Paper text:
Pyruvate kinase isoform M2 (PKM2) converts phosphoenolpyruvate (PEP) to pyruvate and plays an important role in cancer metabolism. In contrast, PKM2 has low basal activity and is activated by an effector molecule fructose 1,6-bisphosphate (FBP). PKM2 exists in a dynamic population of monomer, dimer and tetramer and its pyruvate kinase activity relies on the formation of the tetramer. Upon formation of the tetramer, PKM2 can adopt the inactive T-state or active R-state conformation.
The mutation R399E of PKM2 (PKM2R399E) was shown to disrupt the tetramer formation on one of dimer interfaces, thereby producing dimers and decreasing its pyruvate kinase activity. PKM2R399E also adopts the T-state conformation. No significant difference existed between the structures of PKM2R399E and PKM2Phe. Residue R399 of α14 on monomer C forms hydrogen bonds with residues E396 of α14 and E418 of α15 on monomer D on the C-C′ interface of the PKM2WT structure. The existence of R399E in PKM2 will inhibit the formation of the R-state conformation induced by FBP or PEP, and lead to a decrease of enzymatic activity (compared to PKM2WT). Consistently, in the presence of FBP, PKM2R399E is less active and has less of a tendency to form a tetramer compared to PKM2WT. Compared to PKM2WT, PKM2R399E showed a decrease in activity in the absence or presence of FBP, with a kcat/Km of 0.6 or 1.8, respectively. PKM2R399E tends to inhibit the formation of R-state tetramer (R399E on monomer A repels E396 on monomer A and E418 on monomer B on the C-C′ interface) and leads to a decrease of activity even in the presence of FBP. In addition, association of tyrosine phosphorylated peptide, acetylation of residue K433 or the mutation of R399E of PKM2 promotes its protein kinase activity and nuclear localization, which are correlated with predominant dimer formation.
Residue numbers in the entry:
A (entry chain C): 24 to 120, 207 to 403, 407 to 519, 522 to 531
B (entry chain B): 24 to 403, 406 to 518, 522 to 531
C (entry chain A): 24 to 126, 130 to 403, 407 to 518, 522 to 531
D (entry chain D): 25 to 117, 216 to 402, 407 to 531
Write the structure that this text describes.
C-alpha cells in the first residue's frame, strides 16, 4: 500500500502478467508500406498508423492508407479477435529554412500553411481518425486547424504538437482547445535547454492526465533500432519513463518508417511498455485524480473504477456510441482493462488514444428490445475478454450502460458466465 | 497536496529554489588530475573523487590523492565555506582481463566490425596482443564458452561472437568494434565462471587504501554476501571505518541483492554492465528495485555508467542524457557518478557543472512528503531512531530551514537522512572522515567544525549550533525568522531534539 | 473534516435540518389503546407498536392489534403519505419470584438475617425471618458469596450459608417487602426454560395474528433463540426474532446470541440489576457496536422518558440518555409506560421524535461508513457499498432501493449512509419490518405489476421520487441513487436526476 | 477503527489504564473533618470546592484549614504525595451586575486564603469575566477563573466568554431550567468540544451522582450520564451534595473514580489527537511532537519539567494516551494542574542544584521513581521527557526519548 513497496517488489525474473495498456503509434514509410509487413505490425501490437506529410505526394499517401486498411480488414472475419487500427495524419507545418530554430522567440508563422490546408482536406477525404498538428503555439492555432477541417471533419481528433518554448508557456490555453497533446521531445530539446525538457514532459503529461485528455510522447524513442535489432538500455529506460510519467501513447518514427527492423521495433515497444506496467502504481493515481476533479456519467465512471479495485475485476465493460463514456472512465486510470463496446467504427479507432481502453467493434444488428441489445453487446465483450485472457469464467466484471434507448448512468456488477 | 498536482505545477521558467541534494562523484584521470582543475571541480560541486585502480601504479594514485587533498585544503582557511571532499578507491576486481598489447604496452589496436579475431591461451602471447591474436587470463574459457556465445571486452565497448573452438583457442568475429587497450575487462554473459571474491592485486590495493586513509571502497563485481565479507576482512581492524560500496554488475548480483545489501555499507548500480546480461526492457526495473530497497534500508545508493558520456567530446549533453540522470535522481539515488566525462574527456568541468544543473532541476520534481510518510510505516525501541523520526516530522510541521545534527561518527545524521526530509541536513562534526563520508547520503550537507571543545557542554553545543546557522545563512538555506531543528546527545559523549528560532 | 469540528458546530439556536433516522417503538396500553389516540401517535412518529404480554389476555391484545391496524389503514387512501406500522409481540418470559406473605407487607432490616426456604408450607407464610421462592434449582446456580436482589433491586441480600434446599442471607440493604416480587441472581447461570408454556401460547398467538416481530425475553444463549424459532415454526418463519439481553450471561454469551438472532434489544433496566452501574454503559456501547458491525438491528429499551408518565416534559438527564443511545448507534428507541399507561402518551412520542431528530446533528456519518466498509469480510454487497459511496459524493437526497424481502435495503443500511434509504416494496410485511433499521424509509407500492419489466421499475422509482419530494428529502434538480435488479426475479446501481 | 474499539469492550475485564479525569468534591458538613478528607484524598479527590452560597468566612476558613491539614499529612513522602487544589464557588447574582457586593467580599477573601481557582457563577458575557478578573487584581492574577455557564445567553456568547476565561464549568442542572431538554446535551457537547479545541479546562457539574446522597450505590442512569460526560471530552467531574451533605461522601468519591476509570476504556485516543492536531512556536511544536512520539514508542509517560505549568497544558491539549507527569517546584501550579485531563502533577521539594544539568536529571529521576511507584511504567520502558534547554528558558523546546532506569 506504498509506492516504496511497489518498487521493492519489482522482479525482472517474473514475466509481466498484466496487459499492455499504452497505445502504440507507428510511422509508416518505405520499410513498412507493404500489406504483408503491416499485417505483422498489427499482429505485433500497432494501434495507430501515422503518415508524415513532410514528404510524399497525396497519391503516395492514399496508397499507404489503402494498404493499412487492407491489412486491418484481413482480420475482420473474426470480430472477437479483430483489432481496430486508426489512421493519423501528421502535418508538415510551418518551417523556417536546412531548418532553423529560434529558441524563446514568439514565431509569427501562420498556424496552417497552404500545403497544410491541402493535406488537411485530403485527410477529410481519406476519412482519417485524427490529426497531429505541428508547431502549435497558441489556442488560435488549434482553432484555425479546426476551421480548415470544417463541418465534414468535426469528428476528427486534433492532437496539438508542442515543439517550442511558447507552446510550453501557453500550454493551458492550447490544451483547453485541443482534443489531445503530443510531446515532441526532439524538437523541444533544441528550443529549450536539455536539462529542462524532462520537466516540461512531466508537467504536460500531468496536466493532460488531470484534464482527461490523451497525451502522446514522440521522437527519440528507439532510434538505434533503425540499424540494430535490439535497442540500448538507455532507450528502454527513456521509453519506460514516459509510460511511468503517465503517457497514453508512445510514437515510433524512423524505426518503423525506414529502418531495417520495423517489425522488431513494434515488438520491442510492446515488451518495454508491458514491462513498465509492473512499476505503475494504480491505486494512488485514481485517488489523486479523484480529489482533483471539478453529472450522472461522471459519478458512475468514478463508481465503476472504485468498484473495480474493490472487486478486483478483470475488466470494466463500457457500452458507448461516441466513445465519451469510456474516455471518462479512462481518466481515472483503473488497473482493470476498459473494454469499450461500440458499433461506431470511428470511435473504435480513436479509442486507442486513451490509456487502458481496449476497443471492440460490434457488427451485430441492433436488436428490437433494448434489454436484448444491451445483453448482446455485453456478451460480446464477455467473449472478447475470455479470448484475450482479461478474465475467466467465475470472475466478476463491471458493466456501464444507459438505462433507456439513446438515454450512460447505469452500473452493474456481474459474474463472468 | 497530491503528487499529480506537484507535476502539474512544474515550471521550466521558474529558477531552482532549492539546494542540490544528491552527491556528485567524479572519476579522476589525466584530464582532471591537476591541482588547478581539481580546485575548479570542487567549486563546481564535486563531492567525491573516485580512483579507478584498474590501471595505474600505487605511485601514480598516491600523487592523485595528494593533489585532491591539496586542492581541497586550499579552501580550509574559511570554515564556513569549506566543503569536505571524499576519496574513493574503485578496485580492479576479479573479472577476466586481456593481455598486453604488443610493443610498449599501451599501445592500442583497432578492432573492426566483421573481422576475425583469435583468442588464445598460449602464454607466449600474453604480452603480444593485437587485431589478429588476443590473450586473456582465464585458462578454462573453452570449456565455459560455446559456438555462438558472445564475448564482451572493455566494459561492453567491444563484443565478439565465437565462431569455432580449438583445444587452447577460440576463433571469433568482431561484432561491435572499437579501440582495444591492454588488460581490459572481459565479460562472458550466461557463462559459469570460477572467480574469487577478491584478487591478489585487489588485496594489495585495499591495503594501499588503508595507508592512504581513503574514505570508501567501491568493490567490483559483487555476486554474494561472502564477497563483501572478504573485502571487509581484508580491510580488517585498521580500515574498519572505511565504507564498503558493493558494485552490482551482473544478474547474480541482482538475484542475491538482499544479502549483499545487508552486508554492505552501500550500493552502486552499474547500468552499463547490467545491460550486458540483462535486456533493455528489464534494466530500468532492476534500477528502481535496488534503489528502492536501498532507500528502505537507509543505505547509500550510487548510479554509475552511461550518464553524460557525450560530454567527453561535447560541451553540452543530449536531452536523453539529461532525462536519464534526472530519472536516476527521481528514482531515489543518493549520488550520481561521472566516469570518462571527468577522467579523460575534453570538458571535465562542464561535465561537473552540468551534473549540478540537472540534479538541481530534478529536485523540483521530488515529492518529499510521500517519501517520508511511506518510509515511516515501512521502517523496522531505539531512542535515536525515534528522535530521528521526530526531527524529520517536526521539520515538515515547522517548515524548517534545516535539520542541524551534531555528530561524531555520522550515524545520527544518517538515521535522519533515511526518512528523507525536505529541509537540508547540516551535519556538524569534528571528525574529518565523518565529514567526507557524509556526502554518500542524499540531503546531508556536512560541515567540519575546527573549533576546540569547550568544557561547558552547553556552550560547546551552542557554539557548534551558531556555526551551523552561519553556514546555513551563507548557503541560503534559511534566514532570520526561520526555525531549525537541532539533534544532540544529552550528556557529553543522540536522543535530544530541540526546536530553535534563527536570530 | 473532523468529528470534533462536528461537535463544535452544534447550534442549539438552529432547527433540526435532517429527517429522523431512528425507529420509534411505542408500548400500547390503556392510555393509547383507542383508534383516536393511535392515529395521532402514528402522525407523531410511531413506527412500531409493542404488545407487552406480561399483562393482558389474548383477546385484550387482539383488540389492541385491531385498533392499531384500523388507525394505520386510515391513511391508506394516500399512498404517498402512507406510513407502514409494524406490530411487535414482547413475551413475558421466565422469572423467579417469591410467594404470599401470611395475612400483607413487612419491614426488612439492614444487617439483619433473612432466611430463604423452598418449603411450600411457607409459600404463603413469608415474613421478616422466613421467605420462599419458586426457582427450585436456585441452590445450584447460587453459592457462598452470591448476591440476591428482590423486587427490582430494591432489596439486596448476600449468601452466607449453603443448604440442602435453603439459604441464609444477610440483608445488605433494607427496605420493604411485598408478595410475589421479582428475584434477580446477578452472575448466576439460570436454568429456567427458554420459553415458558405461557410464552408458547403467546408465540402461537403472534403467528395467527400475523405479527411482524417478536421480542424474546431473558435470552441467555443461542439455543434459547432457536427454541423460540422452533415454536414459531414454518408458519412464522418470516417473523423477526429480537433477543432481549437482560443479564450477565446474555452479555458474556452475546456473540452466539447475535449470530442466532435477527436483532438485539438492550434492556438497560434489567441489566442495571444484574451488573454494576459502572459497567452497564460499557455493555450497551459494546452490544450496539457489534450489532452495527454485523448489520443487525439493535433496540435500546427501558428507562427512556419514564418521568413523562406524570409530566408533559422530560428531564435533561432523560433527554441526554436517549440522545446518547442514538449516538451509540442504536437503530430504534423503545418507549414503555409513558405511552402505555401514562397521562401524556402522544407527548412522549413527540418528544422522542424531537430528541432523536436533534441527536442526528451530532452524528458523523462519513466516519461511520469508512470504518464499516474497512471492517467488512457478492454483486449485491458490492453494489450496496457502491451506492453508499456514491451517495456521499453526489450529496444525494436519498438512496432508492427496490426490494421484495427487504434484504437489499438492509445491507445498504449496514454502511450507515447519510442519505435516507427509501425502500420500495409490494410486500406489506417487509415494509413494516424495515423500521428495525436506521435510515430506512419504507414505502408500500400498491400499483399492479407491469408486464414490461423496465416499465415496472420506473413506476416504483417514480413513486419513490414522489415520496421523497413530499417528505422533503429532495427536490427537482437533485440527484439520487437507485438500486434495482437487471431482470424480473439487486446488482444495478443508477445515478439519476430528480424530475 | 472506533467501531472495533467499541466491539472489544469487556465488562469482565478490569480497567487497566489509570484514571485521567480530575475529581472535584464539594466540601460540607459530611466531609469537613480532617480524617474524612484524608480518605477522600486517598480515594481520588483532586480538588476541594467551597460553596460560598452559605456559611461565614470563619466557617470556610476552618474548612480550608482542614483540607490543607489532610493534604499535608501525606507530605512526608514526596513520591506518593498528591497535591490538592482549593476552589471557591461564588454565590452569584439579564442585566444583573457581574459581581455582587457579597461576591466581591468572597473573592478578596479567596485571595487572602490563597485559593487556586474561582468558579464564577452566572457568566453571560466577556465583560462579566473581566470584572471578576479585575476584582482579583494583581494579587490574584495567577488564580484561575472558571466561568459557569447557567443560562441561554451564556451559551450564545460562549466564544467570547471562553476567550476571556481560564476554563469553563457546564452547569447542567441550571441549564435545564432555562433551555429545553432536547437541546441541553447538544450545548454540553458543543461547549466541551470548543474547550478541547481551545485547550482550556472544562468541568461538568450538577446532577452527577445525586442519588448517592441517601444510597451507597448510584443508579445505572447516573453512571451512564457521568461516563458520557467523560467521553464528550470533559477534563473534570464535580460532585455536590454527594460529598457535601450526603450519608456516603467517601463512597461517592470512590464510585466517581470507578466510573471515570471504566469510561477510560471507551476513549479512542488516536482519533482525538489526530483531529486536534489538524485543527491547530518552538514549545507548541515540541508539545505536538512529544504526543506523537508517545504513540509511536508506546511511551509509558510524558515527563514535563515546568514552572508555570503551561508546558504540561500544551501537551494535555493534544490528548495523549500516556500519563503526563508534570514536575514542578511551584506548589500552586501543582494544584492547578488537576484542572487538565491526563496531567499527573508531582511536587519536587529537592533543593535547586548549581549545575543546571544536574538539576534537570534530578527532577527527571524524581518522575522516574513516581512513575514506577504509581505503576505507569517500569525499568526497561521508554518515556518522553520535555525540558528547557538552559536556565531561564521558558520554552520547553527540548524533547528527549529516554529508557526508564
Ligand atoms: Mg518539426
Ligand atoms: Mg566490470
Ligand atoms: Mg424482565
Amino acid at each position: 500500500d506504498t509506492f516504496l513497496e511497489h518498487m521493492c517488489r519489482l522482479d525482472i525474473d517474473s514475466p509481466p502478467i498484466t496487459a499492455r495498456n499504452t497505445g502504440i503509434i507507428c510511422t509508416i514509410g518505405p520499410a513498412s508500406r507493404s500489406v504483408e509487413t503491416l499485417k505483422e505490425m498489427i499482429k505485433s501490437g500497432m494501434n495507430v498508423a501515422r503518415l508524415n506529410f513532410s514528404h510524399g505526394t497525396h497519391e503516395y499517401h492514399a496508397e499507404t492508407i489503402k494498404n493499412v486498411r487492407t491489412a486491418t480488414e484481413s482480420f475482420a472475419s473474426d470480430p472477437i479477435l479483430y483489432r481496430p487500427v486508426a489512421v493519423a495524419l501528421d502535418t508538415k507545418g510551418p518551417e523556417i529554412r536546412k531548418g532553423v530554430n529560434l529558441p524563446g522567440a514568439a514565431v509569427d508563422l501562420p498556424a496552417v500553411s497552404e500545403k497544410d490546408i491541402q493535406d488537411l482536406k485530403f485527410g477529410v477525404e481519406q476519412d482519417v481518425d485524427m490529426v497531429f498538428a505541428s508547431f502549435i503555439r497558441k489556442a488560435s492555432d488549434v482553432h484555425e486547424v479546426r476551421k480548415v477541417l470544417g463541418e465534414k471533419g468535426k469528428n476528427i481528433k486534433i492532437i496539438s504538437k508542442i515543439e517550442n518554448h511558447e507552446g510550453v508557456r501557453r500550454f493551458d490555453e492550447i490544451l483547453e482547445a485541443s482534443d489531445g497533446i503530443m510531446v515532441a521531445r526532439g524538437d523541444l530539446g533544441i528550443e529549450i535547454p536539455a536539462e529542462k525538457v524532462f520537466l516540461a514532459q512531466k508537467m504536460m503529461i500531468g496536466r493532460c492526465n488531470r484534464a482527461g485528455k490523451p497525451v502522446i510522447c514522440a521522437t527519440q524513442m528507439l532510434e538505434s533500432m533503425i540499424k540494430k535489432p535490439r535497442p540500448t538500455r538507455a532507450e528502454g529506460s527513456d521509453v519506460a519513463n514516459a509510460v511511468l510519467d503517465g503517457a497514453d501513447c508512445i510514437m515510433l518514427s524512423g524505426e518503423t518508417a525506414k529502418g531495417d527492423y520495423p517489425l522488431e521495433a513494434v515488438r520491442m515497444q510492446h515488451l518495454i511498455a508491458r514491462e513498465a506496467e509492473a512499476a505503475i502504481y494504480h491505486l494512488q493515481l485514481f485517488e489523486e485524480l479523484e480529489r482533483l476533479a471539478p453529472d450522472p456519467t461522471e459519478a458512475t465512471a468514478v463508481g465503476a473504477v472504485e468498484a473495480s479495485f474493490k472487486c478486483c475485476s478483470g475488466a470494466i465493460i463500457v457500452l458507448t456510441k461516441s466513445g465519451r463514456s469510456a474516455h471518462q472512465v479512462a481518466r481515472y486510470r483503473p488497473r482493470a482493462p476498459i473494454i469499450a463496446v461500440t458499433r461506431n467504427p470511428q470511435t473504435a479507432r480513436q479509442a486507442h488514444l486513451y490509456r487502458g481502453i481496449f476497443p471492440v467493434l460490434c457488427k451485430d444488428p441492433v436488436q428490437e428490445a433494448w434489454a436484448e441489445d444491451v445483453d448482446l453487446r455485453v456478451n460480446f465483450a464477455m467473449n472478447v475478454g475470455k479470448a484475450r485472457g482479461f478474465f475467466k469464467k467465475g470472475d466478476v466484471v463491471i458493466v456501464l450502460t444507459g438505462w433507456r434507448p439513446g438515454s450512460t448512468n447505469t452500473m452493474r456488477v456481474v459474474p463472468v458466465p
